[PDB]
Design a protein around this ligand. Structure first.
Ligand SMILES: [Co+2]
Ligand SMILES: [Co+2]
Ligand SMILES: [Co+2]
Ligand SMILES: [Co+2]
Ligand SMILES: [Co+2]
Ligand SMILES: [Co+2]
Ligand SMILES: [Co+2]
Ligand SMILES: [Co+2]
Lengths: 437, 437, 437, 437
């Protein structure tokens, strides 16, 4: 085809294949419990990193070699990207993709012009969607790149920016609905502060809640049925981002009575940046009924910034997928690759190699996690571990019959409390048996 | 007197005094707005670090030289500590002190024996309280040191430990009420997990909530009127402590409908361990109406464990006291020195030198913070900064009149959004003018 | 036998065995390139964690259940541990063990008494050594636990402590030689500072070098031929430990002309605590000819203190063993398990389960690393990657022929510099193919 | 004047001035020990942050409002910056400035064109230098921004990039000499690695040493007499930067026999990023005779990336200046403000406010540090603390008379070792007395 002529459609070839352009573990067609591997995993391509990132970092310029680099007019570039994107979706065999409104079309000098450019590109994507197998997983609004967002979007000290932010999200909800997106994401990149000295924290949090509330009202109004998702990150670019982690978000949603409308999009790199294991954040969201979708990537725990690397640690993908299987699998969410090739991986085909690495790592982890759940390896131990709550004083405690007085009566009468081993080391070695089975 | 013969009562001598045993900045008697410095600050001595810590660390043995070290019988040691404690309170001139039930008396072979020992010591402390000016700020239960708490207290997988924990807290609430404590603290040292592989997170959080609920029921029953406080810490000894930070606690309290009974005790070292500035955690608690009390100390931001050092950074004490003054000052809470002398500061008089350092640093910070609030230095700028919400579209946004449609109408019609500087550098230099005034 | 009656000798049973008391990956008998797996790996048991640690942490008391717990006399306990240790060595099938002088015998009231106790136990260990297959890998002196070391050992401000430290190390070198130890380790636990305000850094570093110099002089004198090793750690218990990381140690050794006598003992948890990957520290030591031995464990990268966990991450053990194989394998060093069971894993058999987990993880990693080296997977790419230095201007650069003038002449004449991809993502996915082969 | 018409020359007005455009603590004219405050401090303006940074970050576009923003031709912009720079130097009253070759002129399509552009601008700066009081502190080469440096400069796997790097540094040394620079700096931004899988570490370190060696040879040849400086940073943009910290650099310089030519330029933010206090890194460099110059700024210890904030913590500036005074003051180095205004501080005058904040903080810290040194506050205590080395066994240890045998003889004969308090808390409170004197 046109943009990636050197790369043919990627196909499954098994763990012993030497072909770099093939899946080693991910077999889209493999059936597990009545669903193909493809529908269990719901892989999604991130439009921003894949088609707009150029290798630029804070200390250097673009390194990425891209076939659509030669166009000078912003609209020609936007159209070329849509073509390249759909060629890519077809070759990588991706069922989904995600985008920011500002990834797909350039801004104009006014909001009207910006919206006209957006309509042109949306119309084009819609034609491709009619003949592509790839669908939109979720859409979102970029409320952080443009200079107007210096002081925040809905948390801006400038009411005009709040007004603009509302207008942009209104448009973004409309195009997400039109393209058939199944979710809509909010990542508050500039929703936080840089210094407490000039910040009215209560006022900003009140406004943030007003904004989110206006967004759910508008979604109902136009009948958008996709799941609303908040994406936590502790910091960067801000010193403190309000949606610090899953718990912070829940504290916020419950206070402002927004908790019945939102779930969370958890990103591995953002979890570890807050000093939580990816699995902790997944588990905590699960038991709170808010594990909505996942941004599949990894950071480096020795680096204190968002690296957005393709995930290749299969021990981590296993522990992650264990949580997804425990909740019954994805509903509307999926595994969105919010990951970018390293600045040194600047050749076009590296886009393919990066995704193959991540898709294989997650496919393998899914298969192992699935055996861990099916064999009830950890669940049996957990049952035996907490068995004292099944009868006796424990049953009274869980049923609401016990209180401080009755428990004291009980406790004065017992002389020896005997505990048993937590078996962490044993549990970890069993995990290895399954990993390398 | 008996235990600290070489040290006489510590008195204010001003910033030019060479006497190491005197306050340089803290004048208990100084009056500011109708209250003495002593009643503004409400300094409290931590019984555990001050009278029981012995310099032991994870790599070495005790270094602390203590006059009550010669006793062999546990009860003789407990009685000697009460004497020494009250001599110390008098000399350091402390209005308050805090304790754990297990700091003041030794455990016996059964809960009954433990409770009898506790009654003996409580009776003794009560006599001293009749003639001392020092009062009890808050009491608490040590639910983390004894081996029975390996798997947690209320989050233990062993129902017998839950029962014991209830019995201990029941007793602790009773003695706190009897000694006239103004608050009661919960620090969940073992309430978290070490590995997710063997943990039923939802079950443990449910039990934690049941426990806390039984505690408020019992407090009402015996008519204990002190404020209940949860003390956040992200980890250590656990890999993840459930009360991770203020937001985590609020998410929890709101979910289980416990939020109307609890406020938080924020410790500086515990805030920075979760990667929040002490001031952030204070501010967040304030705007949520849960800033209850403070554990005055500092950690080292380059060290990833709880150091509990005496606070000597006056820039930090200023920013901390700014928050306390903004909420109208302490109510029932105070500044409890949850700090210990370094292992190398093992001579008796170092106890005095440590406290003088911390009391002076907080007194100075209070005086500066007070001028910052009185002159409305940061508040004027904040007013001007967010002024666009006082009329026009901003007023419509705050009053509930605006929505996505009206805001879009507005936004399409505006062409230029003009922001103004946040002035962080200017704000920081003004802070220095006040600090060094 | 006597101390671990419930546990029989641990034997290899393969990856499909359900028997928790067996090796799943480690087959001592398996031969690879003329050496058994046992002689490639040289596993060592840490005497301190295995026979003296009791579950105590900074917030709680001992949890460990140990058969020799009933003895009251310190010497009876020391003798019982030697018996238990050799029973354990036999059952876990360990070729080596390491110890601190203070692990094996209790101190007396004077150095003479301490040394007499040590002689008694050393004599006993020597008898067991005559009939055991287990040998001493390395010995070391505990210069950090006793209160006298508060201000450091050789870096103490107290000359008497320097004198004592010299005496202790002299004795420790003597008993290590007598027990046939192949190395001798220096871990400077208290060799650092807590505050710069009271520290003469140059003086302490000079004394540290004097001490180390006296130690090599004495080793020569008694003809001790084992390798001297320094063990880096960035901090804890100190705020800054002088032997911060491998590079810090090399800077020190080169300055004081000690570099020809020392190599390093690298511990995984200590490397990550300094914010280096374990592999980085291994590689850096290798290319500097100082990779001497390894303390096989893992920390938790989200926890800022030394956890000393048994290593179970096989991706990490692979990358570690890759470095050891690249240098030609161990010489006198080995894999010493400086790891302890979690406080919650307090039953005797957990000692076995912990070691099995770590031995299996390292055995598996060795086998994979070995295929990575044999197939030259990364080496081929590295050869192609740096090929421009094989001829042309690159050859002139490496041979010493080029200089700034000639290179400028060359550079002005070239118009396009073309780089090629670093292929990180591809390299990581190939690693996975090998891991899960 | 032309570019900053709203700002007049900044003058000292004292701590009680309300004028934001004035020094509160920095009096250039104040004389201390025969030198003005201006010559003690040697303040330098960083050309890159001050005249080329535009508020761009990794998540957003430029926010900075700059009078020279309207030019379209790269050379017109470069000329306008020189004019603005000298207007700025005059108004802020800066004695020095630093620059990268690539800060002052734009690259062309070839190295020849690049060098011609550079000559044009250098000629212009030279005219301004004839009538300005500001001089060049140090120059440096930007070997990290251009795409060619993806894989490193001298550590590039591409020999052509090594050749180019040599050519650029040759030119940079020439223009630094011509502008009268007193030092020349090497910051290895791309000299490190992203993954060990594709890195030949020994080869890259060998080449790095060859490069540095060619640079000193060329400096001698053209008779450049300024001090060569290496600037440490642990990471960013790389995963590991070779010049990790001062100790790493010394290990490297000593191995390749380059240590007699280099000193270090220590940056506060880069020290804390490696988990060293700024003061530790300053002290360590001092006792090794390599404290060459300082980049005066601060990072945020809770943020894991380089923030380059203006320094406003006067407790830190005091501890920093204490080290500089202890070595006898600056020689050829100075205090270069490698700091930038926050993205939210985008108005022109914020450039002035940022520098005033930093200059005042350092001036105040200098004055306090100076009293700390003059009164020998910490030195007296250090003398008393280590006094045991002045005679007896301690004197034998320092003089080379003692050895393991004699020290053992001594140690067996002593029964009690008595240590004294380290007095950390006392020392910290005295620091506060001086700070707030
Ligand atoms: Co990210
Ligand atoms: Co994301
Ligand atoms: Co603490
Ligand atoms: Co506390
Ligand atoms: Co360790
Ligand atoms: Co070790
Ligand atoms: Co920097
Ligand atoms: Co710098």
């Amino acid at each position: 085809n046109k943009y990636f002529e050197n790369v043919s459609k990627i196909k499954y070839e098994g763990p012993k294949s030497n072909n770099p352009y093939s899946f080693k573990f991910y077999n889209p067609e493999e059936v597990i419990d009545g669903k193909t591997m493809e529908e269990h995993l719901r892989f999604s391509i991130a439009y921003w990193h894949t088609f707009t990132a150029d290798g630029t970092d804070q200390f250097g310029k673009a390194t990425m070699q891209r076939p659509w680099n030669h166009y000078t007019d912003p609209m020609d570039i936007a159209k070329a990207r849509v073509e390249a994107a759909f060629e890519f979706f077809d070759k990588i065999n991706a069922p989904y993709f995600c985008f920011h409104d500002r990834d797909i079309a350039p801004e104009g000098d006014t909001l009207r012009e910006t919206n006209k450019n957006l309509d042109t590109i949306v119309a084009m994507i819609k034609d491709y969607l009619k003949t592509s197998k790839t669908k939109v997983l979720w859409g979102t609004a970029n409320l952080f790149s443009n200079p107007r967002f210096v002081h925040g979007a809905s948390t801006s000290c400038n009411a005009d920016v709040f007004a603009y932010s509302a207008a942009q999200v209104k448009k973004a909800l409309e195009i997400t609905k039109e393209l058939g997106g199944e979710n809509y994401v909010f990542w508050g990149g500039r929703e936080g502060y840089e210094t407490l000295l000039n910040t009215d924290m209560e006022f900003e949090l009140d406004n943030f809640a007003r904004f989110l509330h206006m967004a759910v009202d508008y979604a109902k109004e136009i009948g958008f049925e996709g799941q609303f998702l908040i994406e936590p990150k502790p910091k960067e670019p801000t010193k403190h981002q309000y949606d610090f982690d899953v718990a912070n978000v829940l504290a916020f949603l419950r206070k402002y009575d927004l908790d019945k409308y939102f779930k969370v999009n958890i990103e591995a790199n953002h979890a570890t940046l807050a000093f939580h294991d990816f699995q902790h954040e997944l588990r905590y969201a699960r038991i709170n009924g808010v594990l909505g979708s996942i941004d599949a990537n990894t950071g480096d725990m020795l680096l204190g910034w968002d690296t957005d690397q393709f995930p290749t640690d299969i021990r981590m993908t296993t522990l992650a997928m264990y949580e997804v299987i425990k909740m019954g699998g994805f509903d509307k969410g999926g595994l969105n690759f919010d990951a970018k090739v390293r600045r040194a991986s600047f050749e076009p085909e590296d886009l393919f190699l990066g995704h193959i690495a991540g898709m294989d790592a997650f496919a393998k982890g899914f298969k192992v996690a699935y055996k861990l759940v099916k064999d009830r390896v950890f669940d049996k131990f957990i049952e035996e571990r907490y068995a004292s709550y099944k009868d006796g004083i424990g049953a009274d405690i869980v049923s609401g019959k016990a209180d401080f007085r009755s428990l004291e009566k009980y406790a004065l009468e017992r002389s020896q409390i005997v505990n048993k081993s937590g078996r962490q080391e044993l549990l970890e070695s069993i995990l290895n048996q399954y990993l390398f089975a």
